[model samples]
Every structure is written in C-alpha cells, then in structure tokens.
Target: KTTKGVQLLRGDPKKAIVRLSIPMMIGMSVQTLYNLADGIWVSGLGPESLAAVGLFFPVFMGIIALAAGLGVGTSSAIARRIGARDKEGADNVAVHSLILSLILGVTITITMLPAIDSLFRSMGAEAVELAIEYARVLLAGAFIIVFNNVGNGILRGEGDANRAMLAMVLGSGLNIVLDPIFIYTLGFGVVGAAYATLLSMVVTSLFIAYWLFVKRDTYVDITLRDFSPSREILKDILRVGLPSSLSQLSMSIAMFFLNSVAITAGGENGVAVFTSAWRITMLGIVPILGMAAATTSVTGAAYGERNVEKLETAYLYAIKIAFMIELAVVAFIMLFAPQVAYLFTAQVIKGDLISALRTLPVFLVLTPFGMMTSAMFQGIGEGEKSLILTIFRTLVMQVGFAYIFVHYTTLGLRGVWIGIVIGNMVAAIVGFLWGRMRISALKKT
Candidate 1:
C-alpha cells in the first residue's frame, strides 16, 4: 500500500499509482463539479450574475494555489527530512506552515474585503450588485479556505494523500448537496451559492483540523513547543515554500488577468466560456496532478535513500503516465467538447455555446503536457524553474498570446484558445528540458 524507494516500481506501480491517483483525481474532479454546479444554478439568475460568480474562480483559486504552495512545499520538504531521519526538522517545518497560513489568510481577507466592490467593477462585471454580494461572502471565508488546505497539505506531506483527498471530498460534497438547495429552492441567488461554498469550507476545515490535530500523530503535531520558530526549520520551509507559493500565486494573478481580458474579448459570454473551458481542462489534467504529487513523494524519498537511479525512474513514471492519460483525454475532449458545452451552456445561452466549445479545445491539446511538466519540476524541488514556467504560461506567454490572438487576429475569440495551446506547448517543453538538466546536475553532484 505504501510507495517509497524500491517499493515504487515493485508491487505493481500502475495499480499502486491508480489507487492513489484515481481518488485524488476524483477529489479534484468533484472540486470542479461544485463550481460547475454552482454556475449552472446561478446561470438561471442571469448572464451577468453567472459571469460575476465565475470571476470569483481566479481569486479563489489564487488563494488555494498559495496555500497549496506553502502546504505542498512544506510537505515535500518534511517528507524527505523524515526519510533522512530528521523528525524534529519535519515537525518544526509543519508548525511554521501553520503560522504562515494564519498570517496569509487574515491578510488576504482584509485586503480583498475593503476593495471588494472596486475589484469586481475592475473585472468588468456588468452585473455589479449580484457579483458584489457573491464575492463578499466568498472573500470573508478566505481564512477557512486557507487553513483547510494547510491542514490537508500537512497530511499529504506525511504520505497521507488519501486522507487529504478525503477532506476535499467531504468539503466539496457538502457544497454539491447544498448548492442546488440554496440557489434554487431557497432562492439565495449568487450570494446563496457563495454561502454554500463557505459552509462547505468550514465543515471540511474542521474535519481536516480534527484529523490532523486529534487523530494523526505523524507529521504535523500541533504542540505549543513546536510553535516557537526554530530558525533553521523555518528557513528551510521558506526556502522551499516562498518560490513555490509565488509560482502558484503568479498563475492565480494571471487567471485574474485572463478574466479581465476575457471580459473584453467577448463580454460576459466570453468569460463564461473561459471559465468553463478551464474547469474541463482541469478535469482532464487531474491525473497528471495526482501523478505529480506521487512523483514528489517518490522522488523525495529516493533522494533520502540516495537512489538517483530510482529518482529518475520516478520522474519518468510521472511523465509517461501523464502523457498517456492526456492522450486519452485529448481524443475524448476533441470529440465531445461540443456536446459537453451544449450540455453545460446551451440552455443558459445559445449563440455562444458552440463558439465556447471550439475556443477551449485547443488548450486541452497542450495543457496535459504543461500540467505534468510543471508539476514534475515542482516535485523535484526546482521551485524557481517551476515559477518561471507558471509565470510564462499564465502571465507572460499566455496573457500575451491571448491578447494578441483576441485583438489582432481573425480568430477573434478563437484566438484565445490558440494562444492557450501555444503557451502550454512552449512552457511544457521548457519545463521538461529544465527538469532534465536539473536531474543531470543532481547526478553529477
């Protein structure tokens, strides 16, 4: 059941990986489903309402991305430290993230709360009232979202991906059950949907907290002694964490920027299609993500064992699995994207559905590779390299390409899709090459 060192390739890696990857993938998929469900229900409110709520995704994901960076980096670092028999170092790093999460969470909530209205208007929401209401509720719950993810990341760092995934399922499952009831039956509109999400985070956060604090004795033991910052461990956490956080944070900012451009590209409908495509793309890319996390664990443990050969094998395991899964997803997405768009968007808005479907498929083509490679770099501790790829795809390359295609080309809206695909392809290639070089350097050292 465990995967570390030689056990990685032994006892059926394919099945072992699927066991870890499938549930984690499903957990990620359900997280996407909540948003899709919320959008579907909120679509009944109006186009502008839907667009406004959709706008929350970038900001929301940005926060989660930050949390994941701190969490995952801490986890990966600590896991290796433990494998090297550095329990005290691992424990101290866990405490450092706990403090960091609190500081970051409170700061985000306060900063965004005051500028809530201005931020939404800046995003170009034609439906201000509904958007503001929904956004306010979401922003207020920022702490819950931040802490819950921190808790989960701590668990996963200790090889508890299954439990971490379970926490996500618990939280998102609550949202799925509550979304329709609050949005339609009780008539909460966009605010109600936000409330459902807030409640789900709170519930899941509590569950994760309980598991880590009360039930688990592995990595992150919340003791008063651990709270006093041990400079060495704190430095290690930040060294591994800050760059990783920035990489994720940069992508989140790019999504916000992408939303801004998307609004200009085709108004609310354009934004809607962009959000929808991202969710679908995320769904298809989930397996790579899972594989990436697994690879991190495998690679980190291999480093601890001084097994460079096994480390390379783990990297190949992640890339090859990701490539195969993505190939399958590309075929299915190409064939059914239109039909799926019709299912999600046809009833809500008519003319834009087909256009939306076509615009997003191209991103699907390159995203699998981009996602896998970017994660490969992350797993192997190339935080700066990972940051460059994140920024390149999301901000520099993607935003630049999206703008040029949407404004200067005949593709118009279709140009955004082309830009996304091109960006992914370019970033993935660079990231994969960087990973190879890093590996080579490691072997030489």
Candidate 2:
C-alpha cells in the first residue's frame, strides 16, 4: 500500500481505509462532542435558553462553512502538490490558506462583535437579552474560532489528519472538562457555557499555530513570510471550497429559517423541539461527516494524480462505510430515543418527551438514506453538485413543504419535522442517483 499522508506503507486497502478514516473519525467525533456539549449545558437553562443559543448556531456554522470551503479546497490543492512532489506548490497553498483565513477571521471578528445581539434577535432567539450575552461572547472570540477551524482544515488537507485530530482532541477534552466548572461551580450561567466553549476553541487554535511554527514537519515552511496571496491559488481555493462551504452554511441558514418557521407555528416550544431534533441528528450524522471528510482528501489526491480507479474506489468504499455506520446509529437512536433524550434534555422537556417521541424516530429511516448520499458526493469533489443538492433538499423542497403544511394546512407544528423526514428521503434519492452517475462515468473513462 502507498502512504497517503503520514501513514505507514504496509497495509491492505481495508486497513488503509481504516488508517485514513480513523483520524478523521476522531476529529469529527471531537467536533460533534463540543457542539453537543453546548447543547447539553444550554438545555439546562430552560427552553428559551435553548432557543437563544440554538438560533445562533447556524450563524457560527456559516463562519465555519466559509472556512471549511476555503480550507478544504486549499488543503486538497496542497495535498495534490505534495503528491506530485512539488513542495513549493504545496507551501504556496498553505500560505494562501493562512492569509485568506486570517483576513476573513479579522473581518468577521470586527463585524460580528458589535452586531451579535442583532443577529441573535433576527434568528428568533426567545430571550433576546440573554441570548445576546451568550451569542456575543462566542462572536467576540470569532477570530480564534475561524483560525482554528481553517488551520485544521489545511492540516487535514495536507494529509496530516492525525495532527488535526490531536489538536481537536485536546480542545474538545478541555471543553468538556470546563463546561461543568464554569456553568455550575463558577455559576457563570448561560454565558459562562459560551465562554467555556470559546476558550476550548482558543486552545485548538493555539495548538495549531504552535504546530505550524515549531513542530509540524509537514507545514513548518508555512509562516508570515509565506502569507502573500496569489490569484491562481486563491481561485483554486474558492473554486473547490465555495460550493462545499455554501452547502454547509446554507444548511445553517436553512436551520435558522426552519426555526423561525417552527416558532411562528408553535412559539418557543417549537424552537426547543427543533433544536432537540437538530442536536440528536448531529450526533447521528458524525460518522458520515467523518468518513466523507476522509474520502475528500484521499480521493482528491488520487484525482489530482489522475488515478481514476483509486478515486472511484475511495468513493464507493467510503459510501459503504458511511452506510453501515449510519444504519447502526439510526438503529440505536430509534430503539432508545427515550433514553437518549433523557440524557440531553432538561427535566421539563424530558417530561414532555417531544424529542424522544417526535424527533428521534426520524433518523431510523432518514439518517442513513440522506446523509450518506450527501457525504458521498462531498467525497468525490462534486462541490456544486453537493451544494445544489443541499439547497434543494434543505431550502426549496423542505422549506416549501414545511411552510405549506404548517401555515396553509392543519398539520400545524408537526409539519416542520414531517418536512425534515420527507426532505431527507427526497435528498437521499437525488444525491445517490447523481453520485451513481458520476461514478459510472468515471469508471467508463
């Protein structure tokens, strides 16, 4: 077997797959933990607190989406360079990514610092003042969040997934430890949870910075001296990144819109239910995200070398792995929705059991079918395809169905979730069909 990034060179394809995917799983798993960590703490603050924090999620995700798009593409481009033994080209990609991330980070920090409250208010946060306090603290540390995510993306794209995993593990572990301390012991309350989350992200960012400067043998050449941008590199980064980022960011936007729709139909309870569903779904979706991310870097490098068969193999292989993982998660959530909800929800919501009864079951069927397909296309470098699929599934088709069912008809509040189920069903079918065609054609060539 060939060494892709930092892997040893003696393994079958199955083992290679394991090596490639494990670090990715570790990284994405850590990310999922922190996101869930926020939810876990926020849930205790009451439903309004849940709504307030939940509303700002997609906005934070939009920032992440932008970074991922730019970062992944930059990483892919650099990985290709490394594969071709072009250290100079790889270095250039790394440099350009850093410059782009910092510029966007600084700009976002400046802009969001003042408007954090307004943004949350627009998102339909039930308690505007409390939400603002929580959201603003997160936004205040925007620079670090952006940099950390982007740096990790570049690291992953450069075939250093393990390093990225290490950084995230360190950050996520700290966040988990700190969440209880700040929220309960310190009695910082809702905003304290946000502060803890931000601090965790800061640790991640500093770790990446330190690695890049001092210890990362792979990226040691990337520094301020390499921070200048180039037109070709920038174009490539956006070309590959824009669509993927938009897909994720758009999901966040659509989530906000969906939350607004939910609130309009059922008030704060609607928002809480939706947020619960989202958190649960996120937990279920981690493996797909993890596997797909691995596929992108691994397959993208093969594509760069014109190794079409390897690319095809990676795509099909990742899909199969994602499906199995999704199926298991779906089963676990379906059979034990009540138990899962008890762990995450507050006493009030747990009593109502909206999540256990309503939201948890959606994934038994939807999670495996829809998310796996989306991840498949993502792995194969079909950004526009992925983006289009995402928009149609989330916005046009799902949102349209929700609005009509919730408002124009008598489905009422339940309509929002029903749309989610139907949307996933439709999206899975479309995404898989498209992916199949793409793969078939690749095989033909």
Candidate 3:
C-alpha cells in the first residue's frame, strides 16, 4: 500500500477525509461545468437539438452507470484489501478489474448497437434519427468510458485522489474545449457533442494508462505476467460491484419510465423541459457525490480495519459536510430558479423548466442524505443494503408514485415531480434508520 493509503487508516478522520475529498470535489465540479457547458451549447441549437440529446440520455447514462458500478466494485475490493495489508490481493483485484471492465464494455456496446433504433423508438423519441446518430457515437466509445472509470477506481482505492482528480479534470476540460469546435465549428450538430465526449474519453484513457502502467503512480501494478483469473477475487469484486450495477440499472429504468411519462404528458416540449431541469438537478448533486466518493474510500478502510470508532466518525462527518453543501445548493436553486431555467433554453420552454427546478428541489433536499447513506453502505461493503435503498427510491417509490400521480390524478407533470420528491424523502428516512442500526451493530462488535 502507498503512504496516503496507510495514512487513511490512522490519521485524523476529519482532516484526512477533507484532504482526500477536496480534489475529487474540484474534479467533479469541473465535470459538472462540462455538463453545463454541453447543455448550454446544445440548447443554442434549439429545442429539437436539445430534445434529441435528452431522448438518448437514459441509454447514455445507463452505460455510464455500468462503468461506475464496476468502479465501485474495484474501489471497494481494493480498499478493503489494502486495509487488511494484503498487497498481493489488492494487485490481483486491480488486474481482474481491468479485464472485467474490458469484457463488460465490449458486451454493452455490441448489445446496444443493434437495439438503438428500437430502444429510442420504444421510448417515444420523435427525433429518432438524431437520437440514433448521437447514440451511435457514444456507444462506439463505450470501452474507453468503462476503462476510464475502472482506472479512476484503482486510483481512488490506492488513496491517490489527486491523480484521479487530474484524470477527470483533464477529460472534462478536453471535452469542454472540443464541444464547441465539433458542434459549431465543424457543424456536426448533436452527433458532434457525442464525438467530443468520446474523444475526451480517449484522452482520459491514455492518461490513466500512462499513470497506472507507465508511471506506476498507483500501488497495484497492472501486469499480465503469471496472470490467472481468481474466482474469489471476481466474487469479492462482484459482491459489491453487481449490486452497484443493479442500482444504476434501476435508476436508468426509473428514468426511462419518467421520460415516458413526461413525453406522454407534454411531448417534445415536455422532454426538452425535463432535460433542462435534469441537468440542473445533476449539477446540484455534484458536491454530495464528492462527499460520497470520499466516504467510500474512508469507510472502506475503516471497515477493513474493524475500527468502529473510525467508521462511525467517517460516516457522520461525511453526512454533516454533505448536509451543509446540499443546503447551499438547494438555496441557490430556489432563489434563482427562473434565472437558472432560462440559461438552459429559450423563453418558449422556460416556464415548464422553472416549475420543474422549483418543484423537484423539495424532494431533492433529501438527496444528499439518501446518497450519503448509500455511499456509506457501499464503502463498508454492504452493497445489498445500498442496492435495496436505491431500488426502493427509484424503482418502487419513484416509478410507482409517478405513475399513480400522472395517471390517477390531474397533477400531470407536477405529479411526476411530486412523486420524485416523495420517493426520495421516504427512501432517505429508511436509509437513515438502516444506517443507524448498522452503526449500532458495529459498536456492539
């Protein structure tokens, strides 16, 4: 294990957590900026352009979610091994993760390519050709995205957040610079935005390769010598990884349902408004994600060490910090809902967008709390708990309520928003109670 990885187990929980978290937060913030930039430029091309991208989002996000889930598995597996001072085990897990990412990426791309037209059509996308064009470019580069995510997990698990941060910033920055050139200067339209993202993923992959294989900045070596795939290692990785994957898959499914409802109720214009507000919702959660990332690594280490106090401290401290950050985010969104809405689209759809921004925040306030709980469980190797919470939040509560409100009542789009808020609120409360019980059990042990 590396110096900081060792330090994570012994240092002041608060200071170490902040030191580990800030870089990733900055990187995530830049990534958020990239999303905003992407949305802004795409919006300029008009509602049709924006709706085209929006229509493809659930598929795009699902692919990303798969990579992210694998990364979580990688991070959790490696962090625990390091915590137990099993350097060889950690190295083996790293190699296995890379191979696993390769297989998953290739499989997803192959599977998704053939189904692109059918999938979007099934989703009621009016601009089917545009959605397919964008989807093709993104799916083509799916391997790179998966590899980059696994690379990030390796770095984070090693307690080398600075390098992880650098890789993310570099990729997002490249994407930001390339978006306009490809979209406007090159006249690629929505397809150009997808290409820009793909090219940036390629850049990120190279950077990660340089560090992991060439520079050897990480503790685990990426080597094929004497390589034998370990079932045990794969099992350990999937124990957490599979559940994380399912959680992301569920969210994607939930979004698919939500998008269908929005389209059914409001058509192309509805999808446009939903996309605008969704981007803002994504931006607001960046800080919570940073905190969640930090908690995973920190709590994984503490869990590995069987240090109840450290584990408790890391969880509570992260929740507190997440609370403070999310409060500020909610406040800003509430105060400037219309202003924020206008930034994404023209006045034509601005009213619906603003209503979404305002209405969603009521439930979004519970997001940080729910997310932190999920992260805590994931970090501590309780992948099932996290998965169940996400299922309840997205699949059961979110989708169920949204359907009821949209169908059984006159709430229409507002009912969908209300359902989202209620789902998140209920999920957070359950997660909090479950987390507390787990903490108590840990204390007893």
TM-score for each of the candidates:
0.83, 0.82, 0.89
For model 1, name the residue pairs that clash: none
- lDDT against the true structure, per candidate, is 0.69, 0.68, 0.83
lDDT of 2 at 144: 79
Model 2 misplaced stretches (Cα beyond 4 Å): 1-16, 43-58, 117-136, 223-228, 260-274, 341-382, 401-418, 440-445
Q: Superpose all Cα atoms of candidate 1 onto the true structure and report the RMSD in Å to 1 decimal.
A: 4.0
Of 2 and 3, the candidate ahead on lDDT is: 3
TM-score of 3: 0.89
- Residue 121, model 1: lDDT of 79
The weakest ten consecutive residues by lDDT in model 3 span 1-10
Pick out the ten consecutive residues of candidate 1 with the lowest summed lDDT.
Answer: 1-10
**CA displacement after TM-score superposition, residue 326 of candidate 2 (Å):** 1.6
Q: Which candidate leads the pack in lDDT? A: 3
lDDT of 1 by residue, 109-180 (tens): 898888877877776645677777777888788778778867766765666667778898998999999988
Instruction: In candidate 2, list every pair of residues with a backbone clash.
Output: none
User: What's the candidate order when arranged by decreasing lDDT?
Assistant: 3, 1, 2
**Candidate 3 ranges with C-alpha deviation above 4 Å:** 45-55, 114-133, 226-228, 259-275, 345-356, 401-416
Q: Which stretches of candidate 1 lie over 4 Å from their true place?
A: 1-19, 51-58, 117-132, 226-228, 252-279, 346-370, 399-416
Relative to the unseen true structure, what is the C-alpha lDDT of residue 198 in candidate 3, on a scale of 0 to 100?
A: 95
Q: In model 1, how large is the Cα lDDT of residue 365?
A: 49
Clashing pairs in 3: none
